[PDB]
Amino acid sequence: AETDVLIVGAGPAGAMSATLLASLGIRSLMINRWRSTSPGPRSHIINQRTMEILRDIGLEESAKSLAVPKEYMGEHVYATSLAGEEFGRIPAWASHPQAHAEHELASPSRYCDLPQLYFEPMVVSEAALRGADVRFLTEYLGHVEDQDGVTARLLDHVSGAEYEVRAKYIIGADGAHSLVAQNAGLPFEGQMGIGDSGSINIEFSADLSSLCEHRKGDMYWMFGVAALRMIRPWNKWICVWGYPEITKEEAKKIIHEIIGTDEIPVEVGPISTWTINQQYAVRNTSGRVFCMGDAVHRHTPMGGLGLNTSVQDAYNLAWKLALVLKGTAAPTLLDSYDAERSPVAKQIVERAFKSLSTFPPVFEALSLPPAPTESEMAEALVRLKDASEEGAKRRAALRKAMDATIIGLGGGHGVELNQRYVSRAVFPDGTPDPGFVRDQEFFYQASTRPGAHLPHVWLTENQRRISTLDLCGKGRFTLLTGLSGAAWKHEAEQVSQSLGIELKVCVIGPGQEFVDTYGEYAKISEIGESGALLVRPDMFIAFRAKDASREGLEQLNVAVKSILGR
């Protein structure tokens, strides 16, 4: 064989890497040990960043067609059982109108719900169509790096044959027990994630629309706490509880109990179990090897950051491998992938873990031990309807405990969006880091300073709304300015012809192709009309100039050469 990039793993990080590279005309071979895309729904939250990526490569409309929408997700119920009495609800996934506004303001895209079961084949099939080579039932074994590329060994689970593939780079997208990460010798940290613990799932099928229609939610959590998650509303489900476990048809009895009733016909599907050693890689890159996805960040599902961060890892790297492979960028461009993605890997493992500690106080508020007998809980239900002042303090205590769980259920908007990149890939503009005015995990803060994601606002094109994001992306640098910065067009042209690099310039303003109709661009840009922002193929601002002066203009070339390592 022979390819430019061997992509080991076909899950979200791998499927997305192959699609982006193929879109960029890079030859890739993605492999996967198993028969299919993944049997389980697993990962189901899709945050705005991953829906932006889908938008940029034209797959958002598909994603949206197969995905429950945000209006079905909001009602997070805490209760005894599905048919029993609620303790309370919380506005999950930004359903609170203030949350929703903060959400809608931050991006053109929105939260949906799309199980991995569906997400994966949609991306794998697209990578193949875009020209990536894809090959399942192929079980990576190892590799040997030399100065000019790599030579890993493959075991073919159909033929029984074994073979070699010569590449230039290897992406290790191979999941939570990355053999690619072991062989590249990646150091891992923060392993003290509370005694290694798993969870046990249990798919089933029942029409509980009579218990869900009037209160539409992504999830329904019973107090040992067990979650009822909607695969498809409202006939498909899955029960979770915190735990190699075995269960029979006796799981049907657990479900009925969870439903609080035994009179909807149930149909028990597959039963899996999950385990996690919570860790992150301190570095994600070794020589020609680059790991991503679960391969470098392993954690709890709290916040559903994994799949989303996994795809964003792929979006960071792809255009960089493509530029280097084409000789338009030095290989040192590739150093920033660790510089930018590794701090995201630690932050999300740490955040996902920290959310687990928001749940014991729910039990403490009701004066219930870690594990409560049925008489114990039934008594806590009684204490809670007590007409005394102590019953008040108690109802207030539970409300406060419940509210605090939201950080893990749609409240971490800051965590999802607040990426801040420091690297060679990002040319600093001399301004100091401004801060987050509000808590940076809870609330997103838009920034146009180099290192931040391009902020969303609406422009219009033909009197139709277009996002600032839809101007950019597509495996090509974009320069945004206004009428008074007309010189940018020429400066960009010189820089692009000389550096052999595509750089689209958009002069936003009246009578232009794109118009700052609502004035929201002037508002969000942080700089004069004549200033420019340079936006990387991955939506991040890498260069910012305040005006169109000669010294501002002269600096574009220095920044692009610097970004490219030339």
Ligand X SMILES: Cc1cc2nc3c(=O)[nH]c(=O)nc-3n(C[C@H](O)[C@@H](O)[C@H](O)COP(=O)(O)OP(=O)(O)OC[C@H]3O[C@@H](n4cnc5c(N)ncnc54)[C@H](O)[C@@H]3O)c2cc1C
**Using the rule CB under 8 A, which residue among 71, 85, 245, 554 binds a second copy?**
85
Pick from 197, 517, 557, 562: which binds a second copy (CB under 8 A)?
517
Q: Does 524 bind a second copy (CB under 8 A)?
A: no
Least spacing, CB of residue 103 vs a second copy, in Å: 9
User: First-to-last CA distance in the chain?
Assistant: 32
CA angle at residue 67 from 41 to 93, to 5 degrees? 90
User: Of all helices (H) and strands (E), which one includes residue 489?
Assistant: helix 487-499
Asked whether residue 421 is marked as a ligand-binding residue, the answer is no
Closest by Cα among 350, 340, 249, 256 to 297: 350
* 349-368: contacts with a second copy (CB under 8 A): none
Residues for the chain: how many in total? 566
Determine whether the annotation assigns residue 10 to a binding site. yes
Q: Pick one of ligand X, a second copy, none as the site partner of residue 301 (Cβ within 5 to 8 A by kind).
A: ligand X
Beta strands 197-200 and 86-91 are: unpaired
Query: Can residue 399 be called a binding residue for a second copy (CB under 8 A)?
Result: yes
DSSP 27-80: -EEEE-SSSSS-SS----EE-HHHHHHHHHTT-HHHHHHTSB-HHHHBEEEEES
Q: How many degrees, rounded to 5, is the angle at CA 370 between CA 195 and CA 253?
A: 95
| Minimum distance from residue 160 beta carbon to a second copy (Å) | 8
What is the C-alpha to C-alpha distance for residues 106 and 229, in angstroms, rounded to an integer? 27
Q: Can you say whether residue 42 is alpha, beta or left, with left for phi > 0 and alpha for psi between -120 and 50 degrees?
A: left
Span from 124-132, 434-442, 466-474, 550-558 in contact with a second copy (CB under 8 A): 124-132
Tell which positions 129-148 bind a second copy, by CB under 8 A: 129, 131-137
C-alpha distances out from residue 75 to 55, 229, 356, 381, 442, Å = 27, 12, 20, 21, 19
Residue among 228, 322, 402, 459 that touches a second copy (CB under 8 A): 402
User: Contacts with a second copy in 460-489 (CB under 8 A)?
Assistant: 462-464, 482-484, 486
Closest CA to 150 of 44, 4, 29: 4
Residues at the site binding ligand X, with contacts judged by CB under 6 A: 8-14, 31-34, 40, 42-43, 116, 139-140, 173-175, 179, 272, 274, 293-295, 301, 304, 306-307, 310
Binding status of residue 42 toward a second copy by CB under 8 A: no
Site for a second copy (CB under 8 A): which residue of 515, 546, 562, 565?
A: 515
Q: Is 424 in the site for a second copy (CB under 8 A)?
A: no
**Closest by Cα among 310, 312, 354, 317 to 334:** 317
Is 338 assigned to a binding site?
Answer: no
* Residue 555 marked in a binding site: no
State yes or no: 294 annotated in a binding site: yes
Binding site listing: 10, 13, 32-33, 42, 116, 140, 294
Would you list which residues are annotated within the binding site for FAD? 10, 13, 32-33, 42, 116, 140, 294
